[PDB]
From Swiss-Prot, chains A, B:
Encoding gene, per UniProt annotation: yvfG
UniProt-recorded name of the protein: Uncharacterized protein YvfG
Domain of life: Bacteria
InterPro entries documented for this protein: Uncharacterised_YvfG, YvfG_sf
One protein family per Pfam: YvfG
Protein backbone atom coordinates (compact mmCIF):
# COMPACT_ATOMS: atom_id res chain seq x y z
CA UNK A 1 0.00 0.00 0.00
CA UNK A 2 3.14 2.15 0.08
CA UNK A 3 3.93 2.16 -3.65
CA UNK A 4 7.16 4.11 -3.92
CA UNK A 5 10.94 3.82 -4.31
CA UNK A 6 10.32 3.31 -8.00
CA UNK A 7 11.46 6.29 -10.05
CA UNK A 8 8.41 6.05 -12.40
CA UNK A 9 6.36 6.85 -9.29
CA UNK A 10 7.72 10.40 -9.17
CA UNK A 11 6.81 10.98 -12.82
CA UNK A 12 3.42 9.28 -12.49
CA UNK A 13 2.62 12.15 -10.09
CA UNK A 14 3.33 14.68 -12.86
CA UNK A 15 0.98 12.93 -15.26
CA UNK A 16 -1.89 13.78 -12.91
CA UNK A 17 -0.87 17.44 -12.90
CA UNK A 18 -0.95 17.75 -16.69
CA UNK A 19 -3.72 15.20 -17.15
CA UNK A 20 -5.97 16.53 -14.38
CA UNK A 21 -5.80 19.80 -12.44
CA UNK A 22 -6.09 19.10 -8.73
CA UNK A 23 -3.87 22.10 -7.99
CA UNK A 24 -1.08 22.82 -10.47
CA UNK A 25 -0.62 23.44 -14.20
CA UNK A 26 0.47 21.87 -17.47
CA UNK A 27 4.16 22.10 -18.40
CA UNK A 28 4.71 24.46 -15.48
CA UNK A 29 3.95 21.37 -13.36
CA UNK A 30 7.50 20.02 -13.43
CA UNK A 31 8.96 23.39 -12.46
CA UNK A 32 6.79 23.43 -9.33
CA UNK A 33 7.19 19.73 -8.51
CA UNK A 34 10.85 19.74 -9.56
CA UNK A 35 11.54 22.67 -7.24
CA UNK A 36 9.53 20.98 -4.50
CA UNK A 37 11.76 17.90 -4.56
CA UNK A 38 14.97 19.92 -4.93
CA UNK A 39 14.21 21.78 -1.71
CA UNK A 40 13.73 18.46 0.06
CA UNK A 41 16.93 17.02 -1.38
CA UNK A 42 18.95 20.08 -0.35
CA UNK A 43 17.16 20.28 3.01
CA UNK A 44 17.44 16.51 3.48
CA UNK A 45 20.85 16.47 5.19
CA UNK A 46 23.28 17.54 2.45
CA UNK A 47 25.40 14.71 3.84
CA UNK A 48 27.20 14.56 0.53
CA UNK A 49 27.09 16.80 -2.52
CA UNK A 50 26.84 13.55 -4.49
CA UNK A 51 23.83 12.20 -2.57
CA UNK A 52 21.96 15.43 -3.34
CA UNK A 53 23.53 15.92 -6.77
CA UNK A 54 22.80 12.33 -7.79
CA UNK A 55 19.12 12.82 -7.08
CA UNK A 56 19.19 16.09 -8.99
CA UNK A 57 20.90 14.63 -12.04
CA UNK A 58 18.48 11.71 -12.05
CA UNK A 59 15.44 13.87 -11.28
CA UNK A 60 16.22 15.60 -14.58
CA UNK A 61 14.82 12.48 -16.23
CA UNK A 62 11.38 13.43 -14.92
CA UNK A 63 11.55 17.07 -15.97
CA UNK A 64 12.60 15.94 -19.46
CA UNK A 65 9.84 13.36 -19.59
CA UNK A 66 7.22 16.07 -19.07
CA UNK A 67 8.76 18.44 -21.59
CA UNK A 68 9.35 15.68 -24.10
CA UNK A 69 5.66 14.87 -23.69
CA UNK A 70 4.48 18.49 -23.44
CA UNK A 71 6.62 19.64 -26.37
CA UNK A 72 4.83 21.72 -28.98
CA UNK A 73 4.88 18.95 -31.59
CA UNK A 74 2.94 15.83 -30.68
CA UNK A 75 1.83 12.64 -32.40
CA UNK A 76 -0.70 10.02 -31.30
CA UNK A 77 -4.43 9.56 -31.89
CA UNK A 78 -6.07 11.84 -29.32
CA UNK A 79 -9.18 10.66 -27.47
CA UNK A 80 -12.87 11.58 -27.41
CA UNK B 1 42.04 37.84 -16.30
CA UNK B 2 40.00 40.01 -13.93
CA UNK B 3 36.50 39.69 -15.39
CA UNK B 4 33.16 38.10 -14.57
CA UNK B 5 34.89 37.28 -11.28
CA UNK B 6 32.24 39.22 -9.36
CA UNK B 7 29.06 37.26 -8.66
CA UNK B 8 26.88 40.44 -8.74
CA UNK B 9 27.69 40.54 -12.46
CA UNK B 10 25.41 37.55 -13.04
CA UNK B 11 22.52 39.38 -11.37
CA UNK B 12 23.15 42.56 -13.38
CA UNK B 13 22.27 40.44 -16.43
CA UNK B 14 18.88 39.56 -14.93
CA UNK B 15 18.05 43.21 -14.37
CA UNK B 16 18.25 43.69 -18.13
CA UNK B 17 15.89 40.78 -18.74
CA UNK B 18 13.14 42.27 -16.55
CA UNK B 19 14.01 45.88 -17.39
CA UNK B 20 14.47 45.25 -21.12
CA UNK B 21 13.50 42.38 -23.42
CA UNK B 22 16.67 40.66 -24.63
CA UNK B 23 14.42 37.80 -25.73
CA UNK B 24 13.35 36.67 -22.26
CA UNK B 25 10.65 37.45 -19.68
CA UNK B 26 10.03 39.03 -16.29
CA UNK B 27 10.45 36.83 -13.22
CA UNK B 28 10.80 33.75 -15.40
CA UNK B 29 13.99 35.48 -16.50
CA UNK B 30 15.91 33.98 -13.61
CA UNK B 31 14.49 30.52 -14.22
CA UNK B 32 15.73 30.53 -17.81
CA UNK B 33 19.06 32.15 -16.93
CA UNK B 34 19.19 29.92 -13.84
CA UNK B 35 18.82 26.55 -15.54
CA UNK B 36 21.28 27.86 -18.12
CA UNK B 37 24.05 28.62 -15.64
CA UNK B 38 23.73 25.55 -13.42
CA UNK B 39 23.62 23.50 -16.62
CA UNK B 40 26.97 25.00 -17.61
CA UNK B 41 28.47 24.78 -14.12
CA UNK B 42 27.82 21.04 -14.42
CA UNK B 43 29.11 20.71 -18.01
CA UNK B 44 31.99 23.18 -17.74
CA UNK B 45 33.97 20.84 -15.49
CA UNK B 46 32.96 18.16 -12.99
CA UNK B 47 36.13 18.53 -10.93
CA UNK B 48 34.00 17.95 -7.86
CA UNK B 49 30.28 17.68 -7.16
CA UNK B 50 30.92 20.16 -4.34
CA UNK B 51 32.85 22.70 -6.46
CA UNK B 52 29.69 22.97 -8.56
CA UNK B 53 27.29 22.57 -5.63
CA UNK B 54 28.71 25.55 -3.76
CA UNK B 55 28.52 27.64 -6.93
CA UNK B 56 24.92 26.58 -7.51
CA UNK B 57 23.90 27.33 -3.93
CA UNK B 58 25.39 30.77 -4.38
CA UNK B 59 23.48 31.39 -7.60
CA UNK B 60 20.33 31.03 -5.49
CA UNK B 61 21.13 34.52 -4.22
CA UNK B 62 20.63 35.85 -7.74
CA UNK B 63 17.28 34.24 -8.47
CA UNK B 64 16.11 35.32 -5.02
CA UNK B 65 17.27 38.84 -5.76
CA UNK B 66 15.01 39.03 -8.80
CA UNK B 67 11.92 37.91 -6.93
CA UNK B 68 12.83 39.85 -3.81
CA UNK B 69 12.76 42.88 -6.09
CA UNK B 70 9.13 42.09 -6.93
CA UNK B 71 6.02 42.45 -4.77
CA UNK B 72 4.10 39.17 -4.93
CA UNK B 73 3.01 40.35 -8.37
CA UNK B 74 0.89 37.38 -9.41
CA UNK B 75 -2.78 38.08 -8.67
CA UNK B 76 -2.91 38.41 -4.88
CA UNK B 77 -5.31 35.76 -3.58
CA UNK B 78 -6.07 38.06 -0.65
CA UNK B 79 -3.94 36.47 2.07
CA UNK B 80 -1.84 37.79 4.95
Amino acid sequence: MSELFSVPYFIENLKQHIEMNQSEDKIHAMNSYYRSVVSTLVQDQLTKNAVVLKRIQHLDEAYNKVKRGESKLEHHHHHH
